[PDB]
Amino acid sequence: KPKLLNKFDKTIKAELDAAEKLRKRGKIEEAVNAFKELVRKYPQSPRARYGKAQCEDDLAEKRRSNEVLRGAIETYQEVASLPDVPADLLKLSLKRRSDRQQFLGHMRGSLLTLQRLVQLFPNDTSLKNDLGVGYLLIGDNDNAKKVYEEVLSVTPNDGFAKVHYGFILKAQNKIAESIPYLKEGIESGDPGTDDGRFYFHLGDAMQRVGNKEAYKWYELGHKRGHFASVWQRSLYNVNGLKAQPWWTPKETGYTELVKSLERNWKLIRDEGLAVMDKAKGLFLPEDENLREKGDWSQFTLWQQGRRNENACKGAPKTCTLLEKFPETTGCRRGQIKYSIMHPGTHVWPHTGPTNCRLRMHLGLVIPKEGCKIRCANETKTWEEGKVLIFDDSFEHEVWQDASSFRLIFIVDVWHPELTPQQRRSLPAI
Amino acid sequence: GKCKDGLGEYTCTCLEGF
Ligand SMILES: O=C(O)CNC(=O)C(=O)O
Ligand SMILES: [Mn+2]
């Protein structure tokens, strides 16, 4: 179907197919030399150059070398620079270049490629969509929004554009606006629309507006294998881990950590209060759009398993105490942070990104009433000097209706059933 | 842009190379 040979390449189709055949047989090593020989002999051959690129691409996979993949990325570029390159080959080569650039984290580099692809194929809708994803991966939602707006103006029915536009809208707290786009988008069934992210955010948006049809979408997302369960909707999971909303200290196995937190809770409290009084700027407002209303701020000591040196100068004793517990300081999918919440606060029902951590809450300053946290179907209260443990990958919700501030200490730990090698290899979150 | 308490970001992980 895809025509990859220009006029001259057709005249050397035999040599080209011979070399390509060696690549398919896994003998990539002598295939490189085959294509390189063709590249020397026919320096203008797009198919020969593409072959060299693909061989380098496979060599990168075998050797796991970033350096040779970097080379392959250049060779893919070289294909597009040659004269008389067939459109199918030009598109294929640059698409792969972008794909591999994102793999290396050259997202800025990938953008230029995707921009070039859109410039070269102005009527290819899928490429505009890919450009939008490129913007999303670098955190550029503004430019991403424009792209999908441009796509939708020409192709209103493109489901891929609708889910992503909807995703961007919800991220902008355009909750009502986002729902029809997410819904119609998933309902399109177009390739790339059956993604857990869109089920997750469609139901959440529906929950915020009081649309009781939200859980029908959660149920469907579960049926399609996006969610472990309707209640537990984290998207970055290790399948099989013990799943329950609430944990006891013994169940976690982290009894020594819990002992230390509860024995020394007052020193943790006092440093938190000292920061509130003398350095409240270290407390940063919650910035994930999780609040319906009210005030909620956090003062983070550890994140992604990395100690914040400057923050710990505000809570030196607490940081020193925690150094002894790598099960939390080494949790690269969790944090260690103070969390202050004031009256008139309601946190929307929400879900953490991963099932790979458990979340400890140590009460520091807890008003006698007004403060509570629901996880799944059970609501509980905090106690000063006492630890609560829950899996925040389950839907949970929070209220603050006291008459003074509520301060807790949050300590994330690896899910205890995670092996040491999993704890070592899992990418940070 | 990080996913700390929620799933607000398009991707929560950021990997580079093999
Ligand atoms: O810190 C708070 O008051 C609420 N905490 C959470 O929702 C959480 O731990 O994920
Ligand atoms: Mn939470």
Numbering used by the authors:
A (entry chain A): 330 to 758
B (entry chain B): 99 to 116
Report text from the authors:
Here, we report crystallographic and biochemical results on the structure and substrate selectivity of AspH. The results reveal a key role for the TPR domain of AspH in substrate binding and, unexpectedly, that the preferred EGFD-substrates of AspH have a non-canonical (Cys3–4) disulfide pattern. Whilst the oxygenase domain fold of AspH is typical for the 2OG oxygenase superfamily, details of its active site and the role of the TPR domain in EGFD-substrate binding are remarkable. Whatever the precise extent of conformational changes during catalysis, the results reveal a central role for the TPR domain in enabling AspH catalysis—without it, 2OG turnover occurs, but EGFDs are not hydroxylated.
AspH-TPR-Ox was successfully co-crystallized with a 39-residue fragment of hFX EGF1 (AspH-TPR-Ox:hFX). The AspH-TPR-Ox structure reveals electron density at the active site corresponding to 18 of the 39 hFX EGF1 substrate residues (aa 99–116: -GKC3KDGLGEYTC4TC5LEGF-) and for a disulfide linkage between Cys101hFX and Cys110hFX. The N-terminal region of hFX (aa 100–105) interacts with the AspH-Ox domain and the C-terminal region of hFX (aa 106–116) interacts with the TPR domain. Comparison of AspH structures with and without substrate implies that induced fit involving substantial conformational changes during formation of the AspH-TPR-Ox:hFX protein:protein complex occurs; the distance between Leu433 on repeat 3 of the TPR domain to Pro756 of the oxygenase domain near the C-terminus is reduced from 20 to ~14 Å on substrate binding. The side chain of Asp103hFX, the substrate asparagine undergoing hydroxylation, is at the i+2 position of a Type I β-turn adjacent to the active site metal and was modelled in two conformations, both of which are positioned to form salt bridges with the side chains of Arg688 and Lys666. The Asp103hFX carboxylate side chain in conformation A is positioned to form a hydrogen bond (3.2 Å) with the side chain of Gln627, whilst in conformation B the carboxylate is positioned to interact with the active site metal (2.6 Å) trans to His725. Asp103hFX conformation A is poised for C-3 hydroxylation such that its pro-3R-hydrogen projects towards the metal (Cβ-metal distance ~4.5 Å), consistent with reported (3R)-stereoselectivity for AspH catalysis. Notably, the highly-conserved hFX tyrosine, Tyr108hFX, that is part of the consensus EGFD sequence for AspH hydroxylation, binds in a mostly hydrophobic pocket located between TPR repeats 5 and 6 located on the concave surface of the TPR domain. Unexpectedly, in the AspH-TPR-Ox substrate complex we observed a non-canonical disulfide bridge, i.e. between Cys101hFX and Cys110hFX for the hFX substrate, in effect forming a ten-residue ring. The observed hFX disulfide corresponds to a non-canonical Cys3–4 EGFD disulfide link, suggesting this pattern is required for AspH catalysis rather than the established (Cys1–3, 2–4, 5–6) disulfide pattern.
